[PDB]
Amino acid sequence: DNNFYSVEIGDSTFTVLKRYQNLKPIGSGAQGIVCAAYDAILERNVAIKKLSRPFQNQTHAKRAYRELVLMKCVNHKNIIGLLNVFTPQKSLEEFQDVYIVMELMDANLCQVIQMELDHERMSYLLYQMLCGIKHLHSAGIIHRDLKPSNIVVKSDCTLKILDFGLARTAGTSFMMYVVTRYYRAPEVILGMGYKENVDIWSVGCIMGEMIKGGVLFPGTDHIDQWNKVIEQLGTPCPEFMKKLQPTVRTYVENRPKYAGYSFEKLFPDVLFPADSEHNKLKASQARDLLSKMLVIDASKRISVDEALQHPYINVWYDPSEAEAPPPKIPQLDEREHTIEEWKELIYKEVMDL
């Protein structure tokens, strides 16, 4: 008879399979309704995220279709994986909602930054992130939306990536979505274009956040962000200014020039674990890697491959999380389609279950 069951949670009607019970929602209150439940069949706890109405507009279905198809066919330690997908409606007529279950994680990367950590833990967390993005870049996907709230870790400091970002499609910084400007690159904020090193900037800001305990570049508005970057890092050299668009090229030069601060005073030894030569040398190496990754000019930005071979990170090097086989997604398309086609397109995968 019935294979789905109902409960009204978080001001919303939630209906999924009976295998999961004792629904407990996330208290974060963030967009995307997800609750924690326990799956009886395989004896593991699960996180379940509901699509409210995937087809409210063209922006929704495009991102919803993207994340389902690619999460189904990439399989990596540092990227979150998909276990089951289903929707209660059995025909497309009233098919209107979709649910996604996946492996549960203990916490966000945000809260992990609050608790003091050590170099062994910090680096392994970054190592995982770089091979998470390196596995994505090899597939041809630029995240550009990396932030602590899109990153989850477990009790063993195993890190997994929650989001697939925009997959290198949209280049706008403020869309109809992300509540964070802080971790975004200088090129994206200036609309100068992006390459594969854009994401290196955001892992640099996240890494710097662990050391200090606060957001590295806190910007109240779109343009405060740029001011905060150059208040601490210094004004860029003229060669960087040439490629900028003239309308806002003018503005950067007319904006005041700041010499900037060096990473030793940006990241002092007090915030690091210290008093040891191992600690002092690990404090050096951490700051040195921050310098290579927190570069305004994209051309001197350290690559993810070189970042993995940095002494601070290479201690965890083993090819199977890093040098994985590239995931292949041949249904692939660069095009946008009808709203009715969108439901029919996603209906195929959820009903070919």
Ligand X SMILES: *[C@@H]1[C@@H](C(=O)NCc2cccc(C(=O)Nc3ccc(Nc4nccc(-c5cccnc5)n4)c(C)c3)c2)C(=O)CC[C@@]1(C)C(=O)OC
CB of 125 to ligand X, least distance (A): 14
Site size for ligand X (CB under 6 A): 18
C-alpha span between 300 and 197 (Å, rounded): 10
- Which residue precedes each gap in the chain (C to N above 2.5 Å)? 176, 330
| CA distances, 261 to each of 56, 103, 190, 267, 276 (Å) | 47, 42, 22, 10, 25
C-alpha span between 55 and 64 (Å, rounded): 9
Q: Which is nearer to ligand X, 159 or 308 (CB)?
A: 159
Q: Does 27 bind ligand X (CB under 6 A)?
A: yes
Q: Does 98 bind ligand X (CB under 6 A)?
A: no
Token readout for 207 is: 């890494």
Q: Does 12 bind ligand X (CB under 6 A)?
A: no
- Render 78-111 in DSSP notation, one character per residue: TB--EEEEE-S--STTT---EEEEEE--SEEHHH
Q: Which is nearer to ligand X, 36 or 170 (CB)?
A: 36
Interface with ligand X (CB under 6 A), residue from 31, 114, 247, 254: 114
Q: Does 32 bind ligand X (CB under 6 A)?
A: yes
CB of 162 to ligand X, least distance (A): 5
56 annotated to a ligand binding site: no
Identify the three-state secondary structure at position 269.
coil
Q: Does 34 bind ligand X (CB under 6 A)?
A: yes
CB of 263 to ligand X, least distance (A): 20
CB of 142 to ligand X, least distance (A): 20
Choose among 156, 150, 122: nearest CA to 136: 150
28 annotated to a ligand binding site: yes
By DSSP bridging, strand 98-103 and strand 82-86 are antiparallel
Q: What track of x and - describes contact with ligand X for positions 53 through 92 (by CB under 6 A)?
A: ----------------------------------------
Catalytic residue list contains 163: no
Catalytic residue among 145, 156, 163, 297: 145
Rounded to 10 degrees, what is the CA torsion of 124, 129, 131, 136? 170
Q: Does 45 bind ligand X (CB under 6 A)?
A: no
Interface with ligand X (CB under 6 A), residue from 16, 61, 68, 105: 105
Stated as kind and residue range, the H or E segment containing 77 is none
C-alpha span between 193 and 278 (Å, rounded): 40
* Residues binding ligand X (CB under 6 A): 26-28, 32, 34, 47, 49, 104-105, 107-108, 110-111, 113-114, 148, 152, 162
- Residues annotated catalytic, as ranges: 145
